[PDB]
Amino acid sequence: SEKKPIKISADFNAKAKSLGLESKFSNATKTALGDPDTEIRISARISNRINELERLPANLGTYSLDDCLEFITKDDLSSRMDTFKIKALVELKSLKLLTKQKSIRQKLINNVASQAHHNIPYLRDSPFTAAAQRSVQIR
């Protein structure tokens, strides 16, 4: 507190940490979704939800409490009978198309990362990226 708050030593991992740059020497960070245990758990939860959704009845109308103003005469069709059925179908199908969304997302991410050094200014303009792109084109 009173004295120098840094106290650099000859470790370079405490020295780098004390000045802010700690994770900046590792390739990729540490995350939670990278373990098979959490993956199995998430898959279990998703399968349970899909099971519950599929065990619903097909005839799943909804009484909307605003049908009062629509003077239904036992022959007309209520304009809101399919509102919980539509939501159930939407959730079920969205849960069944998860891998497709994952694939499209990873395609987008890869095709936007591969062009980082060409589309992002502060990466394209550093002397090191420019030097590397020049070094590749040496005839």
């Binding site: 708050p5 802010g20 740059l21």
Partner: peptide
Amino acid sequence: SKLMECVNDAVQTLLQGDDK
């Protein structure tokens, strides 16, 4: 990494003055 923000602000204030 919060100390370096104060350090940068101090250096900028140094650049603001003349007889410093």
